[PDB]
Amino acid sequence: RRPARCYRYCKNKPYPKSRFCRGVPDPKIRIFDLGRKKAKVDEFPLCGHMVSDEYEQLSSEALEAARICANKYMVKSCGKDGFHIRVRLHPFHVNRINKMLTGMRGAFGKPQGTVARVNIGQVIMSIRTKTQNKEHVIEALRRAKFKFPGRQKIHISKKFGFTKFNADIFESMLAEKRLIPDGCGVKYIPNRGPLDKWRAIH
Amino acid sequence: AKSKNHTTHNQSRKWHRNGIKKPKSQRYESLKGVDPKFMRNMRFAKKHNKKGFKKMLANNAKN
RNA sequence: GCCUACGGCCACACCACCCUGAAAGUGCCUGAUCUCGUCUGAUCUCAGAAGCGAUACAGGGUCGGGCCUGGUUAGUACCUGGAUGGGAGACCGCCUGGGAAUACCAGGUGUCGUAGGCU
RNA sequence: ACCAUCUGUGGGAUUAUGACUGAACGCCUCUAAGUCAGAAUCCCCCCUAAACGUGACGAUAAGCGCCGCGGAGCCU
RNA sequence: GAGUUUGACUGGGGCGGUACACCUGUCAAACCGUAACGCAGGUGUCCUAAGGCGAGCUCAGGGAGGACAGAAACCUCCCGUGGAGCAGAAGGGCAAAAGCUCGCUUGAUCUUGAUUUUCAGUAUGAAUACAGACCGUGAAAGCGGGGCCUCACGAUCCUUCUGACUUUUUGGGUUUUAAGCAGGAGGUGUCAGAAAAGUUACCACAGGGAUAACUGGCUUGUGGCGGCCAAGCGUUCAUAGCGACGUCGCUUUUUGAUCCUUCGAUGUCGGCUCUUCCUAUCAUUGUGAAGCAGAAUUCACCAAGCGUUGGAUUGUUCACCCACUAAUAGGGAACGUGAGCUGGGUUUAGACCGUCGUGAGACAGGUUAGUUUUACCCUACUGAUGAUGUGUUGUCGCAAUAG
RNA sequence: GAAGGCCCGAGGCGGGUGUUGACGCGAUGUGAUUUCUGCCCAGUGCUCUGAGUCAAAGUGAAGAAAUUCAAUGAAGCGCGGGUAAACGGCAAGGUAGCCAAAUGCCUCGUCAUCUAAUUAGUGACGCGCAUGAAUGGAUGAACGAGAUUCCCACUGUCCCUACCUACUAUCUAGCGAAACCACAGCCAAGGGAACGGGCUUGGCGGAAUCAGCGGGGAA
RNA sequence: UCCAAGGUGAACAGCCUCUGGCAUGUUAGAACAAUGUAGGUAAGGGAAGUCGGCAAGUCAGAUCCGUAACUUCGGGAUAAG
RNA sequence: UAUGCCUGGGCAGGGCGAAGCCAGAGGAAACUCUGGUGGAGGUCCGUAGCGGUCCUGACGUGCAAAUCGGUCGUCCGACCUGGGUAUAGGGGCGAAAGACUAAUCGAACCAUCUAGUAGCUGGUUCCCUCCGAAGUUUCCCUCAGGAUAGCUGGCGCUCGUCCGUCGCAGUUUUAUCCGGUAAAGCGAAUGAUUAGAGGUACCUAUUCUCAAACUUUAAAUGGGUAAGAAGCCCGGCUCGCUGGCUUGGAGCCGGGCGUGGAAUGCGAGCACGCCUAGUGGGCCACUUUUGGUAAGCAGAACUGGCGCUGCGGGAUGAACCGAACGCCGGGUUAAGGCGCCCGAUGCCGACGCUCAUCAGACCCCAGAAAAGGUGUUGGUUGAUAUAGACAGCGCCGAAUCAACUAGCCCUGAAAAUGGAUGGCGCUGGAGCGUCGGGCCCAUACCCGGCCGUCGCCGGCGCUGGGCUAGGCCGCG
């Protein structure tokens, strides 16, 4: 295919696979969660993200290659069931390609591939694991940067795993029955529902 | 031998060259498109308006 | 305090469930001779007043759903105008002004007019 | 007429690189200061040309050159 | 045989398409408007009701049920904001409606003017709100002069039909006929509306760089070339030599895209000849590295000084093969080089064959024969006189600088 | 078969073939000889027959008449037959032959031969893009300023140039044009209508000329 | 269009001469550079040149011999050697 | 010249050698063979003649508007040629090349129609003053062109022209509406989509990522209207419309009331009158935006600009920055500059950063990336250490180490004539960043002179000069 230099910038409007854009091939990346996904929230407290710094288009080919490069290092350094990689960029923007060139007469091209439009400060790939595996996530996410264009920086989030709550408050909300784990994440329990649900918790 | 299709580039300058002019507001605007039944009775109100000219002079004297 | 007929605004009025309801009213309820309409007096139209508050209806309740209002998100995102600003670029900062929306949190939950009527 | 015959050349700084001494950085280190070797490359010699560049020197016609602050004047 | 015609748009033209008359969503950047051979679709119809009105009714789907009967037949109940339907594309609108069903109907009728939209604010088409008639419907209020709204259509001339009247039919009168007024229809889809097949290399003219083919210029998809990351290969060992999945560049010796320069003309392919240049070094010089014992070879560095040949076939560049060789490296210079050549190719007119066309002819299909013009002008370069100012003149030298 | 075929002609008792008469004249195709000349009459065209369409004139009918209507109704068309050494195709499905050809796109087909080496040549192979039988197929002695391949011989075509001669060029006397020409004439780079000679920044630049030269003047 | 000498030779070929005619073709002198046009030679190799034996060269007259493949029986044929 | 006809002329020397004939042979016969003779033919070599192959030779402003040389075809035949005749332009003639028909032929020549037409090229002649464009809308067998609207100019005309009042506006303010773009949302509808969990493949509660032809929400900018006398207030009249009823509605009449009822600027009106030229190829930039890998690409929105425009600056250059222009003097600046070219720092400028064996040197703008560096300088977050670490061989005796990040430099970084921060050159800066003071000059700004135009409800008929009033004078 063409090099990623041709479809790196978000130059057109988002062109998703819809009833009007038919004939789109299947994306290269199909699995977004790797490792031990069916793990409790207390299993993997630490989480690290691959935050982007460019407003560009990451190809599904680069999303799959960076997924394998990060998985092959977490398996070799943290075991096959000691992490959970979640790719947080689904390729929805379809790329078009013109015919193998009467030159520009009817130049609207046919679908070529799919990219994921990333924003400045948006997470690309997230890895949660034990706290002592902090340096392994930084290196696993660093090796996957070379499989991506542009500039990305590795950030260790203050949240507890893949949840949206800080690690400092997570322990307190668990004791107060405000957070209950449901598989990979937790459910926020407000005080604004029927009281029967409150009796079931306690 | 293609050419340009549509352009409104220099048209705002041409429009404001002499200024966008609104029609001069005239008292007693034109009564075109009004209800014909309404126009019939309004013509009869003005046709027989002089019939009460004597009562108008009498009532003005009371003031 | 409450109930009718007609309404205006059209969920703060809706929905689920539970509790309670004087008096009148409303409804249920009782019949098919006539009016009228159905496969069938269930509906509809008509005739009526033995029975009760079951339901409708109204009021109240729910750490109720929704809805409504406000806070928060946030001067965040976005944006007018400006620069011989930065950067290879992608884009970003500043100047001049303008300025959001979810999640989250809190509060509220019909109201008004006309006419007649009951405590 | 390689179809006969003859001739075709020396250095300099250095590139790459390998090193010396030696810190930074108690050690180490070709490098940071300072040194060495270093090439069909580069510059130069050799070689061809000789500048609105030139040196030495010879001879320089009734004309002509030096020597009298020639001794006075006219044009630039 | 004569005359004429053989649309336009168009990333040249033709072929294709209709972006040529219309409609929906979007593009369109929150009034409207807004382009491209932008995107996704629709249209030349359909309807005596699918028009109009009134009345009743409620849909899609789901749950629970009920002989045959089942995942889908029909009956019943409950939930059901419409998730159904409304002729069609789409959007909007719509629930005791605009849907479904039923019974009465023909406002889809006869008229005048105004208004909206496309707009020049012209026409047509399609709409809006009245008014005057005559009706439909409902108990009535009302509603209705077509379809819930946004598309579903046509000038002059001519023909035809209907209607009206102190209308004409020419010196009067009568009856035919013809003409006129007014309203429909017969149609121009190139849809504001000529009556229209080619071919031309035997071609001609007006022009056009508004516009193609050849160079240059922008671009680098493609081509070529080079990094980065390290799965893996290398018996073992990621990086001696390699580099999958990815990714970042460079080049203008491929091709494409574009159409800016040139159509009162820049001679256009290759070869021959000849000079200089580039390095992304094949060989030679000096090195580093190895999965370097030697030999041979591979990788890399300084590096373009020097060299890179002779032939068969082909017009060919490009390939292929024969040998030779230290090696037989890659390119630019208007794809260097036609007032340097050579015309083989291509590229007029002759002719053959195949396919194609009824034909004339066409064919980047093959084949054969086919005029290659001018320098004495200016620079450049090659040499040849001479010019330069120190008096003239001559000999013997120096030497910048260039090679 | 002449009252004709063919053709000329504005026109006639016009004229040509024709001073002719089928062993003739006129119109075409193929192209000596030898050897064969296959299939298709649907389409187009020609030609030959006797059972819907069919002009003017004529006849009939209605009407005051104009007019209208009706019947009749030529050739030609339509219908039918024949015809391909007619156009053509292979309605018939390419027969005999021939071929990678002057005809084969793929293609520099495959094989053999020809050479150290062959996109060439020849002989073969043929589902042949798209050969083929008087749109003639196949062959073929002799012939050809025809295209092509090889061999012998020969040769400065070449390796690799050299030398000689004649006329030019050259110089002089006499004589003496033309094309061409905005101004003109040393370059590099930059920008520019994207290849300057002139502008920009640099390199720099010395009278007047001779013989050459073919880079440039997009001569 | 007409007339057409001698020699050589098969020849009205080519070459030389006689009769007759002419002054080198709209100029001369000097020089002998390049490059041309025309003519010629070249050792050794012999088409390696080139799209291609282009151009050039080889062969040539006559006499005596010798003459195939193929053929339409005529030829090929001046085969070739 | 093409062809037919008529009447004439001309065509060496040789080669092979056909029918007929003669003779001699062979044979049982039929018949065959040999020698000679003969001199046939769209025969062969070849001269003249007639042709014109190759050299793609010479020449190619030539000898020549088709020739010359060598070579070459044919040369008893469908041969060559003179003369006389025949055929004439849409015709002739053609052994066929669209050949030839007087240097002219895929339709000759001559004169006329004819100054044929051209939406197409070229050109279009004195000065000055003043104003000044358009490449866009609709329609067109249109798309190199017209018609039309717009933009332009001319000619005016109706008024106003101290405050005041009318009237006006590419602008704010106030009041009130409109919209569905950015953003957001999809634990909300439609559509797309990830992972578990719970209850029993679904189902509930969560979770990841999205929309241009999705949306509950929803800006900024933006669009419309209004901000008074054409009003307000009081009292009556008309009507055939409206109707329970002066009940509406609209029109008219009389009287009363400026604090003109937001800010600012400004003279307006006449369907912005009447006639009207040119244009209807545009192009470029910020932002927005479509196709395209991209383009000095194609196509839009908005505004400015170029075209129509010079000037200062960017070396240079249609568009960038500044600023637009009568002719001058003085002054001051803009953008940009101040080592020298080249006007200005010849300041005892300030603080740091940086060494580059391809340093770097500033809008548009005219070559760089990913990835690296134990070059150097900052910063961030950690970790060891005087119960003695780091490094080096218990000794040593003071801090040290790791990761990450950011400046400059460096690697990555290869093109062809010799060359481009503009050049020279610059390294205690003439480099990069942050600033200060001073200084340099544009046709810009200020003041002054002169010229012209334009505007003054301009002045003067009341004379030393004056008033050609179509003159003179004054002001901006």
Ligand SMILES: [Mg+2]
């Ligand atoms: Mg245009």
Ligand SMILES: [Mg+2]
């Ligand atoms: Mg168009």
Ligand SMILES: [Mg+2]
């Ligand atoms: Mg609630």
Ligand SMILES: [Mg+2]
């Ligand atoms: Mg809120």
Ligand SMILES: [Mg+2]
């Ligand atoms: Mg070193």
Ligand SMILES: [Mg+2]
């Ligand atoms: Mg040394």
Ligand SMILES: [Mg+2]
């Ligand atoms: Mg014609």
Ligand SMILES: [Mg+2]
């Ligand atoms: Mg066209």
Ligand SMILES: [Mg+2]
């Ligand atoms: Mg809009």
Ligand SMILES: [Mg+2]
């Ligand atoms: Mg009506």
Ligand SMILES: [Mg+2]
């Ligand atoms: Mg152009």
Ligand SMILES: [Mg+2]
């Ligand atoms: Mg590539």
Ligand SMILES: [Mg+2]
């Ligand atoms: Mg790869």
Ligand SMILES: [Mg+2]
């Ligand atoms: Mg190199």
Ligand SMILES: [Mg+2]
């Ligand atoms: Mg060769």
Ligand SMILES: [Mg+2]
């Ligand atoms: Mg070339």
